[PDB]
Amino acid sequence: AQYNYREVLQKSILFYAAQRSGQLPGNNPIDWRDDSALDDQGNGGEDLTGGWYDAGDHVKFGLPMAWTATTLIWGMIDLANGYGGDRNDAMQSVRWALDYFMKCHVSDNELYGQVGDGHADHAYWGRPEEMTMDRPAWSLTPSAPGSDLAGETAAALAAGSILFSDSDASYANQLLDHARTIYDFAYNNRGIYSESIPNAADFYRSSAYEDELCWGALWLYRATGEQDYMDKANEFLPQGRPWAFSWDSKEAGSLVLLTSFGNSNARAQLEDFLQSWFPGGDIHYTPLGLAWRDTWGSLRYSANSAFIALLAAEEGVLTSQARTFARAQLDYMLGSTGRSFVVGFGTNPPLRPHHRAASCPDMPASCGWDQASDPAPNPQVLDGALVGGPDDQDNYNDDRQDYISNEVACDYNAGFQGALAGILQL
């Protein structure tokens, strides 16, 4: 069959609308979401309202949030024609994240990286609008560094400066000023953010920061044209084959950007990465054709590689085969097995994604832990969300408490949305 990729793209943007924290705008399209977490603030009282909730919880996790933003923005820049008439909506969508990063950047060398204690947050089940627990905020500073989180945040802001150049130059300038300063913080104060924010080490443990130092430098090079950023990127070049592209590992993305700038080693590395993911490579294929990387977030890992493949094909890298692979993977997510893995879309979509707000009945009814375990479909449809997905033999359970199957997250949708745009321009 053929799929309505544009409808999915539009729903993905609505997923991000459903993840908004803070004071929502009057044109909020999600009728079951309202103002929430209005007291989010730093240890000096600084306003930290806004941003996206990470997943089915209410924590603001800076590393996946920033990677999501960078990745979304990359598609809006380089796959603009595919976005087409939805591009402006997509731009306004990601502004929510960018605004929040700028608030997090309270001073030159202090960057808030988390709002919410993941344990306390996950102990609650209910609407974000009705939270009453303490929501601690943790920052990165020279004595508690995080080159990974800071480098990714810098990348997002630099990518944003490119995206917004033409339509909102004053905003783009603000974004780039913060990007430069945040990147200097990341480069000058080396460390793993989840050692500095220990709460995060239970949820988004960072494996390494040098890949964010390369990625952020590449984005700043793209945003400024200043050679010093290429020189910095060259200090941190990807080594070997990336395991995947994700919130944790930036190497495959850096390979695409490096290839775009004429780096020959990177282009060969990118070819070697892609061929492993194509059929008959080193990546496991399920019997129904999903390129399956890991137990957790299998659809996300495939979508992320589909996005890389589409962008690589724009550089003339394994062009046709890359596009064939991307389409096959997207088609698995949308319906090729006979059901959709995108909430609110297609044939037999997931009805019970693991998401607190979606699980709740309409206001003014109470919502609590009984809503986590109810076998009924979620009362609210989390349109657009890509679920965790199946195991290595295509088995999947639409159970709200099967975390492996039915997790939803900002990062799960980020490559996915761009890959939809990329397919739309073929």
> Roughly what angle, to the nearest 10 degrees, separates helices 298-314 and 62-78?
30
d(CA 196, CA 139): 8
Does residue 212 have a known ligand-binding role? Answer: yes
In the range 220-239, which residues lie near Na ion by CB under 5 A?
239
Q: From the list Na ion, Ca ion, none, which binds 85 (C-beta under 5 to 8 Å, kind-based)?
A: none
Give the interface segment with Ca ion, choosing from 18-26, 210-218, 278-286, 386-394 (CB under 5 A).
210-218
User: Does the footprint of Na ion cover residue 26 (CB under 5 A)?
Assistant: no
Q: Which is nearer to Ca ion, 119 or 205 (CB)?
A: 205
Find the binder of Ca ion among 80, 201, 208, 237 (CB under 5 A). 208
Classify residue 291 by its DSSP letter.
E
Strands 291-292 and 105-107: unpaired
Distance between CA 409 and CA 412 in Å, rounded? Answer: 5
Q: Which of 58, 105, 178, 354 is labelled catalytic?
A: 354
Contact yes or no for 275/367 (Cβ under 8 A): no
Residue nearest to Na ion (CB): 240
- Judged by CB under 5 A, the stretch of 207-215, 300-308, 325-333, 350-358 that binds Ca ion is 207-215
- C-alpha 283/C-alpha 304 separation (Å) is 14
* Residue 211 labelled as part of a binding site: yes
Burial class (CB in 10 A: 0-12, 13-18, 19+), 154: buried
Quick check: 411 binds Ca ion (CB under 5 A)?
no
Residue at 135: amino acid letter: R
**What's the CA angle centered on 413, arms 132 and 405, to 5 degrees?**
75
240 binds, among Na ion, Ca ion, none (CB under 5 to 8 A by kind): Na ion
Backbone angles phi, psi at 41, to 5 degrees: -160, 160
Six token digits for residue 374: 């109810």
Does 152 contact Ca ion by CB under 5 A?
A: no
- The verdict on 211 binding Ca ion (CB under 5 A) reads yes
**Catalytic option among 7, 89, 129, 398:** 398
Say how many residues touch Ca ion, by CB under 5 A: 2
How does DSSP classify residue 110?
Answer: E
Q: Look at residue 130 and give the partner it binds from Ca ion, Na ion, none, a contact being a CB closer than 5 to 8 Å depending on partner kind.
A: none
- In this chain, which of 34, 35, 89, 184 binds Na ion, going by CB under 5 A? 89
- Closest residue by Cα to residue 219 from 270, 165, 161: 161
45 binds, among Na ion, Ca ion, none (CB under 5 to 8 A by kind): none
Active site residue 398: yes
H helix runs in 237-284, sequence order: 251-260, 264-277
Please tell me the number of Cα atoms within 13 Å of 215 on its side-chain side: 33
Whole-angstrom Cα distance, residue 140 to residue 138? 7
How many Cβ atoms sit within 10 Å of the Cβ of residue 199? Answer: 20
Stretch that binds Ca ion, among 29-37, 69-77, 95-103, 201-209 (CB under 5 A): 201-209
Using the minimum distance from each CB to Ca ion, give the nearer residue, 157 or 342: 157
**Is the CB of residue 33 less than 8 Å from the CB of residue 360?**
no
Nearest CA-CA partner of 77 in 218, 269, 191: 218
x/- mask, Na ion, residues 317-356, rule CB under 5 A, reads: ----------------------------------------
CB of 213 to Ca ion, least distance (A): 9
- Identity of residue 8: V
Rule CB under 5 A: choose which of 4, 23, 92, 348 binds Na ion.
Answer: 92
Q: Measured between alpha carbons, how far is 195 from 192 in angstroms, rounded to an integer?
A: 6
Does 314 participate in catalysis according to the annotation?
A: no
The structure tokens listed for 106 are: 């309270």
- Tell whether residue 40 is among the known ligand binding residues: no
407 is catalytic: yes
Name which of Na ion, Ca ion, none residue 208 binds, using a CB cut-off of 5 to 8 Å depending on partner kind.
Answer: Ca ion
86-94, 153-161, 363-371, 404-412 -> range binding Na ion (CB under 5 A): 86-94
Residue with smaller CB distance to Na ion, 95 or 339: 95
Binding residue numbers for Ca(2+): 208, 211-212, 248
**Residues recognised as catalytic:** 354, 398, 407
Q: Which residues sit at the interface with Ca ion, rule CB under 5 A?
A: 208, 211
Enumerate binding residues for Na ion (CB under 5 A). Answer: 88-89, 92, 239-240
